[PDB]
Amino acid sequence: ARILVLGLDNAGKTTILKALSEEDITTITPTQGFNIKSLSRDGFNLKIWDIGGQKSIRPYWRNYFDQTDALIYVIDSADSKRLSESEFELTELLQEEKMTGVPLLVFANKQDLVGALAADEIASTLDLTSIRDRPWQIQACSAKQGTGLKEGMEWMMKQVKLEHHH
Ligand SMILES: Nc1nc2c(ncn2[C@@H]2O[C@H](COP(=O)(O)OP(=O)(O)NP(=O)(O)O)[C@@H](O)[C@H]2O)c(=O)[nH]1
Ligand SMILES: [Mg+2]
């Protein structure tokens, strides 16, 4: 499955990917273009695209909308000065024709920091309960500390799997 990871600059996209890859986050720098990582877990082959979020390169996001199987949107839960910007960019994404029906996982990141907003507050600001056109989930997490990441990825896998029924 092809996974696309978006969100504002500094939200923690690359740190989450390296945490999933069991590698060192000490040496992470802002992403000028994008990163690709292949990950095999629980009988699944994930190809993950992590795109840089600085506004200057944000128009490039649309290059990667084709053949997307799931969207992960990352937000810095402790940076309330940037919430309006994060909601504007997500609402634009959800109006894209190429992303019709694609499952949405929101990672409410940096829960380890003082003043981090709870998942329910973030859900309210992003107006997630008004979505009608796709499956969605919000998950609180800390990439520095590893919590929440497994739970999020398990929800996402359930949505993209070929499911067998009786
Ligand atoms: N306290 C804390 N800091 C975090 C957490 N996740 C990431 N950070 C920090 O936040 C900063 C930005 O992380 P980074 O992964 O580069 O963000 P990004 O979303 O990839 N930015 P860009 O899109 O510009 O590449 C880094 O200093 C990183 O260590 C977290 O869960 N807790
Ligand atoms: Mg990055």
Side-chain angles (χ1 to χ4, degrees), residues 143-158:
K144 165 170 174 319
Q145 280 236 105
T147 42
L149 302 185
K150 175 192 192 240
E151 291 83 355
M153 299 300 285
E154 292 175 338
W155 176 89
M156 187 185 68
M157 296 322 313
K158 287 171 190 182

Side-chain angles (χ1 to χ4, degrees), residues 13-14 28-31 35 50 52:
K13 297 179 300 296
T14 303
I28 296 174
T29 66
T31 306
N35 301 315
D50 155 35

Side-chain angles (χ1 to χ4, degrees), residues 52-94:
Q54 283 279 3
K55 184 57 168 181
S56 67
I57 56 188
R58 222 175 272 166
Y60 289 109
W61 285 3
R62 64 180 99 136
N63 291 349
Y64 311 100
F65 291 168
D66 289 311
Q67 294 180 301
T68 291
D69 300 312
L71 174 58
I72 302 181
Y73 193 77
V74 185
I75 182 165
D76 184 343
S77 307
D79 203 347
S80 60
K81 88 199 171 194
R82 293 250 248 158
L83 296 172
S84 290
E85 185 183 5
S86 191
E87 191 276 333
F88 167 83
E89 298 294 353
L90 181 60
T91 291
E92 292 294 316
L93 287 170
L94 297 184

Side-chain angles (χ1 to χ4, degrees), residues 8-15 28 30-31 52-53 109-110 112-113 142-144:
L8 307 182
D9 52 289
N10 203 48
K13 297 179 300 296
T14 303
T15 303
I28 296 174
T31 306
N109 192 35
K110 308 198 188 178
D112 61 278
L113 293 178
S142 169
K144 165 170 174 319

Side-chain angles (χ1 to χ4, degrees), residues 41-60:
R41 301 289 180 268
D42 305 339
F44 297 102
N45 188 26
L46 304 185
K47 195 177 188 173
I48 306 170
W49 307 56
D50 155 35
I51 323 298
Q54 283 279 3
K55 184 57 168 181
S56 67
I57 56 188
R58 222 175 272 166
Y60 289 109

